[PDB]
Amino acid sequence: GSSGSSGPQIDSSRIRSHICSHPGCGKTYFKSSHLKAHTRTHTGEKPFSCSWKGCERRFARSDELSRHRRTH
Ligand SMILES: [Zn+2]
Ligand SMILES: [Zn+2]
Secondary structure: OOOOOOOOOOOOOOOOOEEOOOOOOOOEEOOHHHHHHHHHHHOOOOOEEOOOOOOOOEEOOHHHHHHHOOOO
């Protein structure tokens, strides 16, 4: 038997050495450091967090944050 795990075809031509250890992810980065910053999204509930004066509102997706930090 077999299944369809193809997924999205969204990608950008760029240099990427440090490969993500986590399986399936399939995400590599050039900046040896980037990786470290990436894993963050894997560990924990939400990597991004507003942390404003009196907001205390976090988010999982990036765009979500930026879109939320617009009304502030
Ligand atoms: Zn990953
Ligand atoms: Zn906020």
